[PDB]
Amino acid sequence: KILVEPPSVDMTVKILRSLKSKYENFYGINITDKALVAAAKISDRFIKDRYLPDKAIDLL
Amino acid sequence: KETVAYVEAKTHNAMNVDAVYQEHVSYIYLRDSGMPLGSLSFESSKGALKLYNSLSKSII
Question: Any chain B CB within 8 A of the CB of A3?
């Protein structure tokens, strides 16, 4: 049993911020940096069945 | 004894040690149990005395 931890939302900001190069080169459309933080923090208080990296990445 | 005295201020990170001390084993138990980012146990002999002032900053 190696326990895999939840990735602690302020780190998922750092995950998606590292992923700015890939999605903007995937389909071209510029992504604001306000909404990247807002893609994670609004995913907390509202969505429950999914969790932190799935919520932060599927919405983009 | 300087390497023994090195242990208590460098509990879980020692970085040049050819020996298995007691606090190496206790790292692994925390590493295996549900121990998050650097807590009380990671703040051993330095941070566990800083608790009464910490909770005073949150609760007065």
Answer: yes
- Put simply, whether A4 touches B (Cβ < 8 Å) is no
Q: How was this structure determined?
A: cryo-EM
How long is chain B?
60
CA distance B54 to B46: 13
| Sequence letter at residue B41 | S
Give the Cα-Cα-Cα angle B32, B34, B35 (nearest 5 degrees): 90
Could you say which DSSP state residue B48 is in?
G
Task: Check CB contact under 8 Å for B36 and A5.
Answer: yes
Cα→Cα distances A26→A9, A16, A51, A55, Å: 24, 14, 24, 19
